[PDB]
């Protein structure tokens, strides 16, 4: 199966002018495995999954030193951003960043990522070529020129095609029992008599891993994603996921609807009906 | 070459004293990195500043400290000096593209005490009449002697202007008393010209020796002149016969 | 983390050689070569970033693998003599700090065109009556040996370049506080050329 690694940064200024808060969390697929939070007397990177605990103290210190340094630099970056947008010191603002690597079935790098948002909207992103930027506005264009002068893209490319894929592969081996396991969903269909000559059919998927799934309702063969309530894939808490999908049918009787579910854990797509 | 400006270029001090080194980054660079190069060892990272704040460190000693000033200039303070602090201290500023550009260095020598510090005597020895006849060339020798420690810069000045062509000075000074730990030093240099050039009474030859010695921030409690930083020279005019 | 070899390199003028730099890092941010002349700060030469990359300028060409960098030096000349420093930045560390190897200290032995070995006596310009002996114009082969007499000072060899006449010259100096000191015997410790000239 294909896998990814991402680091998620938030640098948030405090409303007034207290020290901004910097947080970094690291994921392999949907599994959190590190966290650093700058709001502490002596902040350290901490483990969040069992399989990362085996890394020695030099690994932890390298992480911690990167994050402590980012804590300092992102504070200036925040000051830079509110300057570009003529914003005052009162008011909280945020820089969010995600970067990391996608590998495919082969274990080899499919694509690399480095995207930034300011106050919740796309600000600057590393293009797929890993050598050019997409800048949102003239302010992001100021950031682009700084990052071109500093060869950021080049160094991110080196990381992404080097360090990133290497460590991802390492974490994928160390935690293979959970990261390289795909659990199929437990599926069923619920009937909800709304009474109207109308009813809701709901197709359930429980206990799957990983999170990526497809649930669609079919009217005698045809996909109808319009008029289909498709709820968000949600953590069940025990490192599995859940999802459902619903359609309003003219039941009386009217049972020509099937639910179709695709998931990696599954040998072949399932097709299910309501069994009264 | 290179933009980074470091003072002082040379420092002689006693054990237990404190010194300050100064670094200006290249104009446009915002960072200062401090490195130590000890006798026989490679450059070692001490500490980095960026735009006035401490960035990274560094196997810097607790008795060493540094700062970067709003001006971007930086100072490295070395307290409670030991003999083992004797070394070259380099600072570098980083460019946006990632290259470090280095200063010319500050050479620190720490001494048990300063009583043994001596400036050089210099003497210029005129060319051999026999060399002139044999080669149509003429070699002057400069001898710099009795100096301690080894902080000297020897230069040749012909008709009032420095020359590098036709010169070679010893890479290393010699110990006059090689068994003695605080042995005074001797250094030699040659300037070779053509017989005709030398034989011109109007041509003027000067051996200059810059000694780096004592600093006024250190006491002198002996009769001879304090061995301060100073230039010592010897000269000769060209000669017909 | 960075190891350079050899630590000392002793080449004849014209003799090409390659200086090695091995490095270990989490990930290479950049590998750097610097030249350092006695008493000066490291001077920038090249930066390489990825395996297979090469940069060339005059007689130097730097190349990069995933395990090492080489600085090839083609047909070196005396002026190439210096310390060559390798240094690396790491992608697992913040900022731009370099960690250096210990350097390769290169000396290039000059070719000598028309050796004319001789030993001459120089007179002090002041008098004084101090005197010095000059062993000069010997070939690239001869080595000047130290005396065990602590009253006789003898310098190492030293090549001067009269660039006007593409003329290179070796020389060593000897002197003594001893009056009885004579230039005929000043360099006695050394194996001297049988054709050495001794003016009288």
């Amino acid at each position: 199966g294909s896998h990814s690694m991402r680091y998620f940064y938030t640098a948030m200024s405090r409303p007034g002018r207290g020290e901004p808060r910097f947080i970094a969390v690291g994921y392999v697929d949907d599994t959190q495995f590190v966290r650093f939070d700058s709001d502490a007397a002596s902040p350290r990177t901490e483990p969040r999954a069992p399989w990362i605990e085996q890394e020695g103290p030099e690994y932890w210190d390298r992480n911690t030193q990167i994050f402590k340094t980012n804590t300092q630099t992102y504070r200036e970056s925040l000051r830079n951003l509110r300057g570009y947008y003529n914003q005052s010191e009162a008011g909280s603002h945020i820089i969010q960043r995600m970067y990391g690597c996608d590998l495919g079935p082969d274990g080899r790098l499919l694509r690399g990522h480095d995207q930034s948002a300011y106050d919740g909207k796309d600000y600057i992103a590393l293009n797929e070529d890993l050598s050019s930027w997409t800048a949102a506005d003239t302010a992001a264009q100021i950031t682009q020129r700084k990052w071109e002068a500093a060869r950021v893209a080049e160094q991110l490319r080196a990381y992404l095609e080097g360090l990133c894929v290497e460590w991802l592969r390492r974490y994928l081996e160390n935690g293979k029992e959970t990261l390289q396991r795909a659990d199929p969903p437990k599926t069923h269909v619920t009937h909800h008599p709304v009474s109207d000559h109308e009813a809701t059919l709901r197709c359930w998927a429980l206990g799957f891993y990983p999170a990526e799934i497809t649930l669609t309702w079919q009217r005698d063969g045809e996909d109808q994603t319009q008029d289909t309530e498709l709820v968000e894939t949600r953590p069940a808490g025990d490192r599995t996921f859940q999802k459902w999908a619903a359609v309003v049918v003219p039941s009386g009787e009217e049972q020509r609807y099937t639910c179709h579910v695709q998931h990696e854990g599954l040998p072949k797509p399932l097709t299910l009906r309501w069994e009264p | 070459d290179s933009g980074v400006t470091q003072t002082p270029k040379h420092l002689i001090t006693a054990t237990g004293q404190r010194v300050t080194l100064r670094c200006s980054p290249r104009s446009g660079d915002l960072s200062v990195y401090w490195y130590q190069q000890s006798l026989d060892q490679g450059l070692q990272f001490l500490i980095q500043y960026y735009n006035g704040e401490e960035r990274a460190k560094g196997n810097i000693l607790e008795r060493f400290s540094a700062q970067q000033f709003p001006d971007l200039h930086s100072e490295l303070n070395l307290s409670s000096l030991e003999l083992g602090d004797s070394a070259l201290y380099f600072c570098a500023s980083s460019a946006r593209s990632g290259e470090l550009f280095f200063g010319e260095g500050s050479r620190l020598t720490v001494l048990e005490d300063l009583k043994n510090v001596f400036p050089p005597e210099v003497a210029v020895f005129e060319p051999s009449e026999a060399e002139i006849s044999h080669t149509q060339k003429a070699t002057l020798v400069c001898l710099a002697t009795g100096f301690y420690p080894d902080h000297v810069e020897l230069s040749w000045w012909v008709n009032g202007k420095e020359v590098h062509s036709g010169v070679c000075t010893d890479p290393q000074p010699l110990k006059e008393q090689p068994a003695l730990n605080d042995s005074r030093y001797a250094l030699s240099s040659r300037l070779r010209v053509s017989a005709t050039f030398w034989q011109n009474p109007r041509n003027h030859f000067r051996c200059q020796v810059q000694f780096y010695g004592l600093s006024e921030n250190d006491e002198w409690t002996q009769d001879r002149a304090k061995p301060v930083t100073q230039i010592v020279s010897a000269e000769a005019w060209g000669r017909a016969d | 983390q960075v190891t350079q070899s050899p630590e000392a390199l002793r080449l004849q003028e014209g003799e090409s050689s390659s200086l090695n730099c091995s490095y270990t890092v989490s990930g290479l941010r950049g590998l750097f070569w610097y030249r350092q002349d006695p008493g000066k700060g490291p001077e920038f030469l090249f930066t390489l970033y990825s395996a297979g990359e090469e940069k060339e300028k005059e007689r130097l060409k730097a190349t990069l693998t995933k395990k090492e960098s080489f600085l090839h030096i083609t047909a070196p000349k005396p002026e190439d003599s210096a310390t060559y420093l390798c240094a690396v930045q790491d992608l697992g560390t913040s900022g731009s700090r370099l960690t250096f190897g210990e350097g390769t200290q290169l000396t290039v032995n000059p070719n000598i065109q028309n050796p004319d070995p001789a030993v001459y006596q120089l007179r002090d310009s002041k008098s004084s009556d101090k005197s010095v002996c000059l062993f000069t114009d010997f070939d690239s082969q001869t080595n000047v040996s130290q005396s065990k007499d602590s009253d006789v000072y003898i310098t190492d060899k030293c090549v001067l370049d009269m660039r006007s006449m593409d003329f290179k010259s070796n020389s060593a100096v000897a002197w003594s506080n001893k009056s009885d000191f004579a230039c005929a015997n000043a360099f006695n410790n050394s194996i001297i050329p049988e054709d050495t000239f001794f003016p009288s």
Partner: peptide, 11 residues
Amino acid sequence: HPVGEADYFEY
């Protein structure tokens, strides 16, 4: 393992 930011990486 995260990436280290070199100097002048600010927005």
